[PDB]
Design a protein around this nucleic acid. Structure first.
Length: 137
DNA sequence: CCAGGAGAAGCC
DNA sequence: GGCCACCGG
């Protein structure tokens, strides 16, 4: 389960599909927490973007950022011809406003996210694809 | 013919 | 201390 901060249109086919199906898991995790009376203050939430421990929790108070990114992930999936079923983001207006903040990453955060993507591609450079082509080979 | 392959954190 | 919205021989 990984949220990327990079340009959705730059994502490799396999990374695009992954984030498309994984990002909505955060809405569910938070809703279940609100169900148990949890509040934003009851979570760690790193002050800066991180991968590894704290990664998913980092977005628990940034659902508006996620909602907007899922709209782009969806549009990109359709642009490339993916036969996805869920073409809309779930409504999140039922979730407390406090969990729905926007977010503007700094260049370093965006670069840390990109480095992870690049590290994964370097492991199978002839296999990842972009619009169906092995452009990383 | 349909399986491989794109980890943090909630729960016992 | 462990056990969650798709695209080729």
């Amino acid at each position: 389960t990984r949220i990327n901060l990079t340009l959705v249109s730059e994502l490799a086919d396999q990374h695009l599909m992954a984030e498309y199906r994984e990002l909505p898991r955060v809405f569910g995790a938070v809703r279940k927490h609100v169900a148990n009376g949890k509040r934003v203050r009851d979570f760690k939430i790193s002050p800066t973007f991180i991968l590894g421990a704290g990664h998913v929790t980092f977005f628990y108070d940034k659902l508006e950022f996620l909602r907007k990114r899922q709209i782009e992930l969806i549009a990109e999936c359709l642009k490339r011809g993916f036969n996805i079923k869920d073409t809309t983001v779930q409504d999140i207006s039922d979730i407390p406003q406090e969990f729905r903040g926007d977010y503007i990453p700094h260049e370093a955060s965006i670069a840390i996210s990109q480095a992870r993507l690049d590290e994964k591609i370097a492991q199978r450079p002839t296999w990842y694809k972009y619009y169906g082509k092995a452009i990383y080979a």
